[PDB]
């Protein structure tokens, strides 16, 4: 598609039906987001064969200049922090320009889990484990990867101002390397090189 | 419900299945929205018996300190301006503290229309007619009225900072006065007095 439905950005699809996704995310060094409507998001996720859509990754906090966990699975968006709440949420999060190791489990005892390893704004290197409980995800159609500047409503599209670039590297699903396929490029440049993708958002 | 799904605010329901809604909206004199996540929205709308949900009203522009049209009917969110684009959109809109006369037509030749009469930030008094074309709305279950501070993602709820109060007065559906029923009050105080409702958002 020419446009992303809830804002601007780049999207790739990962043609795998696997259960465990891993990638190394290189966070932007700088974020320009001189608007009063959008939020930068960087995330993976999947479409279940049932139709359930999951967005799982990080959101940029303008207030704290860090990246924090982002997770939504269908209608369920209440996150449970299993570990690391005090190190990577509230006034803390993954620091700009750092690398974050991400693992996504579509279904671990009926819960969708995202584990993130990296460094926070205080220089602490550790882990934050987040879940959406009781999602009970069955088979998967495909996985996705996006970098976006999202808005609550459509008309707000023209007002979006966002400039940031990110990489998803060494993408593996069920321990197999997966090469993403370029999808939408809406005020974004998407570059794929094997199981690696760089998405540069610029509006 | 104790919480609104996409943010904070107050909600009332209008137990009418009628086709044409009218109300006089008194816009807030002041808007405090000292956050980097939410947008203030004031709107009416309906739930069709098909399940289709419509949100039809105004959004606050922090950039220009005005209220502008906001309309969405199910999956259709591309607004067509029939009249008044140059007077009440982009760097112009309904001025703070002013009164706006609103008429909503669920189905006018297959289109959902909102007509707004009021005064813009340049002191021009006029009309803006906006439509979502090809909605072809059939029977209605009920209408609604809300004043909210909405966010794109759930975790941003706690960070919302919004203080603004608005009134929907002389509410009529198919020329009959309708008394709203208080629903959710989530960091908002809702007061109903006959076919009039005041919603004071404060977080």
What's the 3-state SS for chain B?
Answer: CCCECCEEEEEEEECCCCCEEEEEEECCCCCECCCCCCEEEEEEEEEECCCCEEEEEEEEECCCCEEEEEEEECCECCCEEEECHHHHCCCCCECCCCEEEEEEEEEECCEEEEEEEEEECCCCEEEEEEEECCCCCCCEEEEEEEEEEECCCHHHHHHCCCEEEEEEEEEEECCEECCCEEEEEECEEEEECCCCEEEEEEC
- Count other Cβ atoms within 10 Å, centred on residue A165: 20
Closest CA to B162 of B135, B110, B199, B196: B199
CA distance B194 to A167: 57
Yes or no, beta carbons of A153 and B79 under 8 Å apart: no
Cβ distance B61 to B68 under 8 Å? yes
Q: Smallest Cβ distance to A63: which of B36, B72, B155? A: B36
Closest CA to B130 of B191, B66, B87, B179: B87
Beta strands in chain A (DSSP E): 7-14, 20-26, 39-48, 53-61, 66-73, 80-83, 99-108, 111-119, 125-132, 140-150, 163-173, 176-177, 181-186, 188-192, 197-202
Closest CA to B21 of B52, B57, B49: B57
Task: Tokens for A122, please give them.
Answer: 């205080």
- Residue B30 burial by Cβ neighbours in a 10 Å radius (0-12, 13-18, 19+): exposed
Long-range contacts of residues A61-66, Cβ cutoff 8 Å, at least 24 apart: A61/A93, A62/A33, A62/B36, A63/B35, A63/B36, A63/B159, A64/A91, A64/A92, A64/A93, A64/A121, A65/A31, A65/A96, A65/A121, A66/A92, A66/A93, A66/A94, A66/A95, A66/A96, A66/A120, A66/A121
Instruction: Name the phi and psi angles at A179, rounded to 5.
Output: -90, 120
Cβ distance A202 to A34 under 8 Å? no
Q: Smallest Cβ distance to A70: which of B35, B68, B153? A: B153
CA distance B47 to B29: 30
CA distance B20 to A105: 49
**B150 contact residues in A (CB cutoff 8 A):** 152
Helix (H) or strand (E) holding A86: helix A85-88
CA distance B185 to B200: 9
CATH number at residue B161: 2.60.120.1270
- Count other Cβ atoms within 10 Å, centred on residue B178: 20
**A152 contact residues in B (CB cutoff 8 A):** 6, 39, 150-152
**How far is the alpha carbon of B75 from chain A, nearest alpha carbon, in Å?**
10
Q: Which residue is closest to B33 within chain A, CA to CA?
A: A36
**A156 contact residues in B (CB cutoff 8 A):** 39, 59
**B130 contact residues in A (CB cutoff 8 A):** none
Name the one residue in this structure whose structure tokens are 């706006």: B100
Long-range contacts of residues A16-19, Cβ cutoff 8 Å, at least 24 apart: A16/A140, A16/A142, A16/A143, A16/A173, A16/A174, A16/A176, A16/A178, A17/A139, A17/A140, A17/A141, A17/A142, A18/A140, A18/A143, A18/A173, A18/A174, A18/A176, A19/A105, A19/A106, A19/A107, A19/A140, A19/A173, A19/A174
Q: Tally A–B CB contacts below 8 A.
A: 55
Yes or no, beta carbons of B63 and A36 under 8 Å apart: yes
- Residue A177 burial by Cβ neighbours in a 10 Å radius (0-12, 13-18, 19+): exposed
Q: Smallest Cβ distance to B152: which of A151, A154, A155? A: A151
Residues 6 or more apart whose CB falls under 8 angstroms from that of B41 comprise A153, B55, B57, B58, B59, B60, B70, B146, B147, B148, B149, B150
- Count other Cβ atoms within 10 Å, centred on residue A138: 11
Cβ distance A75 to A56 under 8 Å? no
Name the one residue in this structure whose structure tokens are 């072809």: B136
Q: Tell how strand B7-14 and strand A181-186 pair up.
A: unpaired
SS3 A118: strand
Q: What's A44-55 look like in SS3?
A: EEEEECCCCEEE
Q: Which residue is closest to B63 within chain A, CA to CA?
A: A36
**How far is the alpha carbon of A154 from chain B, nearest alpha carbon, in Å?**
6
Closest CA to B100 of B86, B118, B114, B84: B118
Buried b (16+ CB within 10 A) or exposed e, B48-83: beeebebbbbbbbbeeeebbbbbbbbeebbebeeee
Cβ distance A118 to A97 under 8 Å? no
DSSP code, position A85 = H
Compute the Cα dihedral for B187, B193, B197, B200 and give only its sign.
Answer: negative
Q: Smallest Cβ distance to B59: which of A39, A72, A153? A: A153
Q: Is B19 left (phi over 0), alpha (psi -120 to 50) or beta?
A: alpha
Closest CA to A128 of A137, A120, A117, A136: A117
CA distance B119 to B167: 17
Q: Taking CA A33 as the corner, what is the angle to CA A96 and CA A180, rounded to the nearest 5 degrees?
A: 65
Closest CA to A115 of A146, A143, A138, A81: A81
Q: Compute the CA torsion angle A151, A155, A159, A160 (nearest 10 deg).
A: 30
Instruction: Name the phi and psi angles at B87, rounded to 5.
Output: -110, -25
Closest CA to A62 of A97, A35, A102: A35
Q: Smallest Cβ distance to A63: which of B70, B79, B159? A: B159
**B59 contact residues in A (CB cutoff 8 A):** 153, 155-156
SS3 A35: coil
**B78 contact residues in A (CB cutoff 8 A):** 154
DSSP code, position A94 = B
> Which structural domain, as residue segments, surrounds residue A28?
1-203
**B77 contact residues in A (CB cutoff 8 A):** 153-155
Q: Is B69 left (phi over 0), alpha (psi -120 to 50) or beta?
A: beta
CA distance B115 to B103: 5
CA distance A24 to B6: 31
Compute the Cα dihedral for B16, B11, B5, A147 and give only its sign.
Answer: positive
Greatest alpha-carbon pair distance for chain B in Å reads 43
> How many domains is chain A partitioned into structurally?
1
Rg (CA), chain B: 16
């Amino acid at each position: 598609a020419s446009e992303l439905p809830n804002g601007i950005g780049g999207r790739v699809y990962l043609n795998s039906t696997g259960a465990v996704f891993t990638a190394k995310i290189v966070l932007p060094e700088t974020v320009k987001n001189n608007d009063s409507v959008s939020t930068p998001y960087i995330y993976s996720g999947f479409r279940a064969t049932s139709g359930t859509e999951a967005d799982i990754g990080l959101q940029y906090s303008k207030q704290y200049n860090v990246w924090k966990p982002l997770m939504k699975v269908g209608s369920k968006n209440e996150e449970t922090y299993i570990e690391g709440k005090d190190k990577f949420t509230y006034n803390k999060g993954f620091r700009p320009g750092s690398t974050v190791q991400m693992t996504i489990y579509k279904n671990l005892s009926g819960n969708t889990r995202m584990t993130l390893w990296g460094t926070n704004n205080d220089g602490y290197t550790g882990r934050i484990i987040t879940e959406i409980q009781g999602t009970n995800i069955g088979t998967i159609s495909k996985w996705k990867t996006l970098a976006t500047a999202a808005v609550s409503y459509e008309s707000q599209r023209d007002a979006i101002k966002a400039t940031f670039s990110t990489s998803f590297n060494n993408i593996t699903i069920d321990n197999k390397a997966v090469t993403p396929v370029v999808d939408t490029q809406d005020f974004a440049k998407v570059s794929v090189a094997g199981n690696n993708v760089t998405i540069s958002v610029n509006k």
